[PDB]
Amino acid sequence: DLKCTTNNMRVWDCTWPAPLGVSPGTVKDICIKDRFHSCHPLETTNVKIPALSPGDHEVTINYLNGFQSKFTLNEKDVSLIPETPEILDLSADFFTSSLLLKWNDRGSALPHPSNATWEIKVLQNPRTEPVALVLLNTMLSGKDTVQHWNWTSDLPLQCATHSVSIRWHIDSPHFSGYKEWSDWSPLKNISWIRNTETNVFPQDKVVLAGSNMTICCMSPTKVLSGQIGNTLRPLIHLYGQTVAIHILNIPVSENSGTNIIFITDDDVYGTVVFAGYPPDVPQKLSCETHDLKEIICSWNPGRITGLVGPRNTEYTLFESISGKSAVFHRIEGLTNETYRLGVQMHPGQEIHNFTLTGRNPLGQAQSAVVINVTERVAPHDPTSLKVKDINSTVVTFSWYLPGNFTKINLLCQIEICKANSKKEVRNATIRGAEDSTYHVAVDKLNPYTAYTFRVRCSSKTFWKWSRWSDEKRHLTTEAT
Amino acid sequence: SPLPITPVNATCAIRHPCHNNLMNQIRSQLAQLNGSANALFILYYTAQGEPFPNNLDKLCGPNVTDFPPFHANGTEKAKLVELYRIVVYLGTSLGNITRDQKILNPSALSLHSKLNATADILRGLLSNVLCRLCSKYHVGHVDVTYGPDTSGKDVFQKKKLGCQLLGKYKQIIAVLAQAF
Ligand SMILES: *[C@@H]1O[C@H](CO)[C@@H](O[C@@H]2O[C@H](CO)[C@@H](O[C@@H]3O[C@H](CO)[C@@H](O)[C@H](O[C@H]4O[C@H](CO)[C@@H](O)[C@H](O)[C@@H]4O)[C@@H]3O)[C@H](O)[C@H]2NC(C)=O)[C@H](O)[C@H]1NC(C)=O
Ligand SMILES: *[C@@H]1O[C@H](CO[C@@H]2O[C@@H](C)[C@@H](O)[C@@H](O)[C@@H]2O)[C@@H](O[C@@H]2O[C@H](CO)[C@@H](O[C@@H]3O[C@H](CO)[C@@H](O)[C@H](O)[C@@H]3O)[C@H](O)[C@H]2NC(C)=O)[C@H](O)[C@H]1NC(C)=O
Ligand SMILES: *[C@@H]1O[C@H](CO[C@@H]2O[C@@H](C)[C@@H](O)[C@@H](O)[C@@H]2O)[C@@H](O[C@@H]2O[C@H](CO)[C@@H](O)[C@H](O)[C@H]2NC(C)=O)[C@H](O)[C@H]1NC(C)=O
Ligand SMILES: *[C@@H]1O[C@H](CO[C@@H]2O[C@@H](C)[C@@H](O)[C@@H](O)[C@@H]2O)[C@@H](O[C@@H]2O[C@H](CO)[C@@H](O)[C@H](O)[C@H]2NC(C)=O)[C@H](O)[C@H]1NC(C)=O
Ligand SMILES: *[C@@H]1O[C@H](CO[C@@H]2O[C@@H](C)[C@@H](O)[C@@H](O)[C@@H]2O)[C@@H](O[C@@H]2O[C@H](CO)[C@@H](O)[C@H](O)[C@H]2NC(C)=O)[C@H](O)[C@H]1NC(C)=O
Ligand SMILES: *[C@@H]1O[C@H](CO)[C@@H](O[C@@H]2O[C@H](CO)[C@@H](O)[C@H](O)[C@H]2NC(C)=O)[C@H](O)[C@H]1NC(C)=O
Ligand SMILES: *[C@@H]1O[C@H](CO)[C@@H](O[C@@H]2O[C@H](CO)[C@@H](O)[C@H](O)[C@H]2NC(C)=O)[C@H](O)[C@H]1NC(C)=O
Ligand SMILES: *[C@@H]1O[C@H](CO)[C@@H](O[C@@H]2O[C@H](CO)[C@@H](O)[C@H](O)[C@H]2NC(C)=O)[C@H](O)[C@H]1NC(C)=O
Ligand SMILES: *[C@@H]1O[C@H](CO)[C@@H](O)[C@H](O)[C@H]1NC(C)=O
């Protein structure tokens, strides 16, 4: 019969109507029997009391002259209308057209494990909001929490200023009365402080090929047309001749980027957007070595991402066990052709864990390979063949083959081609070394005849042959 | 990389000396640029993507203001000094318009080739022009202004500003190369 309220679950704000028969503001005590015999003073018919023990209690109210009122009060008459929480800050990103909202969970003032829920609510300039969405939030007793909400602008890019709001509702399994909805926070306003001349948003953005993206236009002059690459779109008034269009679904711009332009009677305000494919899992990946100084990795780009320079993918090759690594970035666009990346290796080593990571401001892609270097030795082509006489029937055939080959040994071939005969091919092995000339004794020849030599090399563990040499071509020799 | 380049600090003190004839070189050189012009402008706007060729006058309007004056008559000196500025002016900005296209349209070798030669020849006309503006004229140093693009910011604008500049160039060379 004595209707109550509370902001937190600590103190009851209880008011009763006066006992009719001219007794007005002649109020002395209001007494409660709970914990102890406590008695509170009065100025008028309502008062601020400490929340008591669940159950029924004798609440008597004394009036000055004679009377006194006898009131049965509980926990389940009381309603819990929480305080208005205030928005602490409203830092806003402009690059990404997005909002951050941070407030004080006054959890310091609300007892024990208690699930409480928030109706946040945004808005721009139209008669209603973009978003009004609700957060689950369980509350930690005692410790105030500093909880966030990271929302992002569906539509424009802050060219049109936003308001935000938040009401919260507490529950408690250790409270009994009508768990009630609080009320709306005093609204919070964020705004553009015009940075540049520019009047159309957003500039220079890169987006996923075929992306339902929205773009807007701050204008002085009633805007007549809005179009991406001659396909004008039906444009929609936002507020002050400042207007916006939807790019339905976007085809991947070329190198120069797709242009979206607006025209008013007077001037022309416009914007470039780049439409992209993230890089594709790089393809036919296989590394080898022609020298034993450095490893090289062949690979194919894949689907070409349609983008250029800064945006063109940046392939990075990473030897794990080494730590050593290198980088690829071509300004011109990529092909169906295959490119190679020139990584160093510390002497010998062997075990090799390769990670090729193509990055491009939209997504990542990565394939790996694992290589026993000394199993990939597939050397350059041998050069500068000199031939030196020993006897009539024998010659010293020698060349120079680039590469650290001191650990390994190579076996080479000698196409001793003589005139008008079958190709005599010889298979002899030699000990290799540091960027060095190699020497072969060649025998069982014919004195004074039309010889021609070819050399062709690989490691005795062999990956693949050298190319075929050049042409040595020499005669033989006599006695007298 | 291909390097265009137009000198600002020109001086009868420091400049590169020249061959013979002079006037009839800068006549030839002048009206030569006039040739390329159209096609190089075509080429520019062409690859700036749609809808650039269909709004050719609203976007690539022969317009960019603050532009170095030219007067029709007056003594060789006037014509020559005046020209000199215009030259300084384009080649300054013209370099930039390239250093742009160098990363926006790095595929049209077709465009660079032009852009690049239209700088080379432009540089010549310069030394050749002052080379006369120094032999029986003695100004000492033509005082000058620098072209557009401090930033320019937006890709977009950088296209318009280049589409506009090229527009006037096209519009201006056609006078220049007739007058003297
Ligand atoms: C990269 O690959 C290379 C080339 O295969 C590899 O170097 C090779 O290592 C193996 C062992 O890992 C060597 O083979 C051995 O040679 C000697 C004989 O001189 C023996 O110790 C071994 O015999 C035993 O193991 C055999 C296994 O097949 C058995 O058949 C045999 O009964 C024995 O139990 C074995 O034959 C080989 O000599 C080298 N290759 C050369 C010539 O250098 C290397 O391990 C790989 N990368 C690295 C550096 O780990
Ligand atoms: C040209 O020389 C070759 C051999 O070349 C040999 O090796 C060089 C690197 C030099 O050090 C030379 O001094 C040396 O000759 C001659 O053919 C070779 O002849 C020798 C002598 O007969 C052979 O050695 C013989 O081996 C047999 C056993 O097989 C013994 O019974 C002998 O005692 C003798 O030592 C050698 O095997 C043979 N080499 C080949 C590839 O057949 C070649 O006769 C000579 N010709 C000319 C024009 O002088
Ligand atoms: C914490 O509370 C949520 C939601 O509480 C509701 O919102 C209040 C304002 C009021 O409407 C109450 O009646 C609701 O309980 C609980 O999630 C709900 O659970 C119910 C029942 O399963 C379900 O039908 C709803 O769809 C849920 N809504 C949401 C927002 O999730 C949630 O179970 C509570 N969490 C804990 C830890 O107890
Ligand atoms: C990409 O956008 C299309 C179209 O979006 C609709 O039209 C816009 C002007 C805007 O008002 C949006 O809110 C609209 O939804 C989406 O295609 C529509 O998808 C819905 C739900 O699947 C469907 O009911 C409609 O029939 C679709 N319209 C047409 C003509 O296809 C599409 O789903 C979006 N893609 C995504 C997932 O981003
Ligand atoms: C990329 O090329 C491959 C290989 O084809 C050859 O080499 C190319 C680099 C190119 O220069 C071609 O002219 C050469 O013919 C193409 O491989 C084909 O792939 C399709 C689909 O997987 C398959 O049906 C064919 O059999 C392949 N062709 C043959 C016979 O090798 C591939 O199509 C190219 N990829 C792209 C993205 O276009
Ligand atoms: C809200 O969250 C988003 C993404 O979770 C944040 O955007 C990221 O910001 C960092 C720092 O520069 C970068 O990794 C990217 O720019 C963003 N990543 C995403 C999500 O794409 C954003 O900063 C948050 N909002 C605020 C105001 O801090
Ligand atoms: C934040 O700005 C908004 C709007 O600019 C203010 O609330 C609106 O103010 C306009 C103009 O004063 C009124 O006509 C409307 O009644 C308000 N609109 C809404 C959505 O209620 C608000 O007063 C400002 N608040 C702060 C904290 O600065
Ligand atoms: C060429 O390769 C050889 C090894 O294949 C290098 O010689 C080795 O040097 C290291 C020093 O770290 C020693 O541990 C080894 O004992 C050496 N011997 C070999 C052959 O393994 C040589 O330094 C390499 N040359 C260069 C500098 O590339
Ligand atoms: C190679 O390194 C990668 C690191 O991502 C790891 O996944 C893998 O286990 C390693 N394997 C070998 C062969 O060392």
H or E element: which one contains B111?
A: helix B109-132
- CB atoms inside a 10 Å sphere around CB A469: 22
E strands, B9-124, where? none
- CB atoms inside a 10 Å sphere around CB A34: 15
CA A313 to chain centre: 15
Cα–Cα distance measured from residue A319 to residue B49, given in angstroms and rounded to the nearest whole number? 41
Beta-bridged to residue A261, according to DSSP, are A227, A270
A78 CB-near residues (< 8 Å, 6+ apart): A4, A5, A6, A12, A14, A51, A177, A178
Range of the domain at A48: 1-81
Query: Is the domain of A88 the same as that of A186?
Result: yes
Cα–Cα distance measured from residue B25 to residue B27, given in angstroms and rounded to the nearest whole number? 5
Query: Is the domain of A211 the same as that of A271?
Result: yes
Q: Which of A191, A209, A224 is the last residue of a domain?
A: A191
Look at ligand 9, atom 1, and give the residue with the nearest C-alpha: A353
H or E element: which one contains B126?
A: helix B109-132
Decide if A385 contacts A472 (C-beta within 8 A).
Answer: yes
Cα–Cα distance measured from residue A159 to residue A245, given in angstroms and rounded to the nearest whole number? 13
Q: Which of A356, A378, A400 is the last residue of a domain?
A: A378
Query: Is the domain of A393 the same as that of A438?
Result: yes
Distances from the Cα of A168 to the Cαs of A17, A78, A360, B70, in angstroms?
A: 30, 18, 42, 71
Look at ligand 4, atom 37, and give the residue with the nearest C-alpha: A212
- Domains of chain B, with CATH numbers? 1-180 (1.20.1250.10)
Cα–Cα distance measured from residue B150 to residue B145, given in angstroms and rounded to the nearest whole number? 13
Query: Is the domain of A326 the same as that of A312?
Result: yes
Single-letter code of the amino acid located at A344:
Q
Cα–Cα distance measured from residue B54 to residue B59, given in angstroms and rounded to the nearest whole number? 9
Query: Is the domain of A99 the same as that of A63?
Result: no
Cα–Cα distance measured from residue B63 to residue A308, given in angstroms and rounded to the nearest whole number? 30
Cα–Cα distance measured from residue B52 to residue B104, given in angstroms and rounded to the nearest whole number? 15
Among chain A residues, the shortest Cα distance to B100 is held by: A256
Contact: B103, A310; criterion CB under 8 Å: yes
Query: Is the domain of A86 the same as that of A187?
Result: yes
Decide if A59 contacts A29 (C-beta within 8 A).
Answer: no
Domain count, chain A: 5
Instruction: Select from B106, B153, B156 the Cβ nearest to the Cβ of A308.
Output: B106
E strands, A292-451, where? 294-299, 314-319, 325-329, 339-344, 351-360, 363-372, 383-389, 395-404, 409-416, 424-431, 434-442
Query: Is the domain of A168 the same as that of A154?
Result: yes
Q: What is the DSSP letter of A214?
A: E
If you write DSSP's letter for every residue of A88-119 in order, what string do you get?
A: EE--EETTTTEEEEEE-B-GGGS-SSEEEEEE
Query: Is the domain of A44 the same as that of A126?
Result: no
Query: Is the domain of A61 the same as that of A117?
Result: no
E strands, chain B, where? none
Decide if A180 contacts A169 (C-beta within 8 A).
Answer: yes
In the PDB record, what is the listed experimental method?
X-ray
Beta-bridged to residue A314, according to DSSP, are A329, A359
Query: Is the domain of A143 the same as that of A47?
Result: no
Among chain A residues, the shortest Cα distance to B50 is held by: A229
Q: Hey, what are A369's tokens?
A: 């390979």
The domain that holds A25 is classified in CATH as 2.60.40.10
Helices B155-179/B76-104 angle, 10° precision: 150
Query: Is the domain of A394 the same as that of A445?
Result: yes
Decide if A117 contacts A168 (C-beta within 8 A).
Answer: yes
Among the atoms of ligand 1, which is closest to the Cα of residue A350? 49
Cα–Cα distance measured from residue A54 to residue B114, given in angstroms and rounded to the nearest whole number? 90
- Set of chain A residues whose Cβ sits within 8 Å of the Cβ of B49: 229, 253-254, 256-259
Single-letter code of the amino acid located at A394:
V
Decide if A124 contacts A160 (C-beta within 8 A).
Answer: yes
Q: Which of A81, A106, A128 is the last residue of a domain?
A: A81
Q: Which residues of B30-57 are buried (b: 16+ CB within 10 A; e: fewer)?
A: bebbbebbeebbebbbebbbbbbeebee
The experimental resolution of this structure, in angstroms, equals 4.0
Q: How far is the CA of A284 from the centre of ligand 5 (A)?
A: 12
B159 CB-near residues (< 8 Å, 6+ apart): A256, A259, A272, B48, B52, B100, B104
Provide φ and ψ at A463, rounded to 5°. Answer: -110, -45
Torsion of CA A378, A384, A389, A394, to 10 degrees: 20
Q: What is the DSSP letter of B65?
A: S
Q: How far is the CA of A205 from the centre of ligand 6 (A)?
A: 15
Beta-bridged to residue A246, according to DSSP, are A214
Checking DSSP bridges between strand A206-208 and strand A268-276, what pairing results, if any? parallel
Cα–Cα distance measured from residue A88 to residue A162, given in angstroms and rounded to the nearest whole number? 16
Query: Is the domain of A372 the same as that of A383?
Result: no
